[PDB]
């Protein structure tokens, strides 16, 4: 996260860190708890990862340094990638992880509510992106979970910025005109969470951008409301 601040413990209880164990154990991507065996994340996180067996999902983590040899984690039973995601395209960037065991809910780990079918993103003026990603284009994964408040931009505005790419209605963009706050590398798959009527909703999944936090180059997010049906179907 570029231009972010440290989160506090329990602040983002739906945020998870997905680790690969191969060749060495480390943070791969963010994700969101959306039910007791279900993590929602970005499909593109699984480029050179196919086997669930290499994944470990950690919840209730503030600092990556909290994760020790003996720390509890969730195994992943299945990776569910949307059928229309292609490795040659940036869209349909959404996946489910089915966990091998059940997340136990506490104040520091619980699901985030999905937007309801037909909800409208223009409603949201309090949107936050979170993760352990880079603070600038070339950097390192950060130890403490970071947060930044960023404003949603209209699809029409976002297409104007990305003449080369097809920004569909299944994508949402966010960022300041002047840049400075954005998701960056390592933030992929994590939430864009917007607070409305005192409730946090999962509006976006961090997906892609042209660099990090550049002037007139908003980050792009999978627009979660357009996938509620997919989610419900795959999870039943």
């Amino acid at each position, epitope marked *: 996260i570029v231009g972010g601040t440290a989160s506090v413990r329990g602040e983002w209880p739906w945020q998870v860190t997905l680790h690969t164990t191969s060749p060495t154990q480390r943070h791969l991507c963010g994700g969101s708890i959306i039910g007791n065996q279900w993590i929602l994340t970005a499909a593109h996180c699984f480029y050179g990862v196919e086997s669930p067996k290499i994944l470990r999902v950690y919840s209730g983590i503030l600092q990556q340094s909290e994760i020790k040899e003996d720390t509890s984690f969730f195994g992943v039973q299945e990776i569910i990638i949307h059928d229309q995601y292609k490795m040659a395209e940036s869209g349909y960037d959404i996946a489910l992880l089915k966990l091998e065991t059940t997340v136990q809910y506490t104040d520091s780990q619980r699901p985030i509510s999905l937007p309801s079918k037909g909800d409208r993103n223009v409603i949201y003026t309090d949107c936050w992106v979170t993760g352990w990603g880079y603070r600038k284009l070339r950097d390192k994964i950060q130890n403490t979970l970071q947060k930044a408040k960023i404003p949603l931009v209209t699809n029409e505005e976002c297409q104007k910025r990305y003449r080369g790419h097809k920004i569909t209605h299944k994508m949402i963009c966010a960022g300041y005109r002047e840049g400075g706050k954005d998701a960056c*590398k390592g933030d992929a798959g994590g939430p864009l969470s917007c607070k409305h009527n005192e409730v946090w909703h999962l509006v976006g999944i961090t997906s892609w951008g042209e660099g990090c936090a550049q002037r007139e180059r908003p980050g792009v997010y999978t627009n979660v409301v357009e996938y509620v049906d997919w989610i419900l179907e795959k999870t039943q």
Partner: antibody
Amino acid sequence: EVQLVQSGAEVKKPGASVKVSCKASGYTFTGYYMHWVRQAPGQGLEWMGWIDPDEGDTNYAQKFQGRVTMTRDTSISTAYMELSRLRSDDTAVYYCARLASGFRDYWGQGTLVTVSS
Amino acid sequence: PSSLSASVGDRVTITCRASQGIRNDLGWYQQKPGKAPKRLIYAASSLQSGVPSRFSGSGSGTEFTLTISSLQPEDFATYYCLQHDIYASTFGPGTKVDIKR
């Protein structure tokens, strides 16, 4: 004008170490990371790692982890790459380079390191 | 390592693969024998200052492409992508564009 000037050619025995220097001028040294890239004779480019001359943090390719150390000395605008436990396929030209996105790139002239008995 | 024989005037397209996680952080470099590489494109599609406009780049998903619209004599060289991912940067293998006389 930006210039990166490296130290001269080295010959080393297998199992020894080598330390190559790269001195920068014409820009703010601490503003831009410095990357090390090597190329064995007739072969492709191989990225080795970077160093942040501001805070001093490094990042090394997997292949060199545990055998390379990059360092800097800010006041003489110089980066260093030290490779240990040399083997015959460490024989290569080594470059330092400023590769920051959104600006021109700059490269050192290269340093031949030959590893042999 | 790859070899491509082309004529002056041909259009050439070179393809690199990298995680979409790189956030377009992909450079294209040109190298002639005896010389250090020179960057042509950064950020997948931005043409570096001083580079001719016949060079262009594109990124979509995991697929990154350098296009030379119409090759000129001075363009015969070896081309490499450099992807900058979360834990490491990596050069692609090298495409040598030879003169098809």
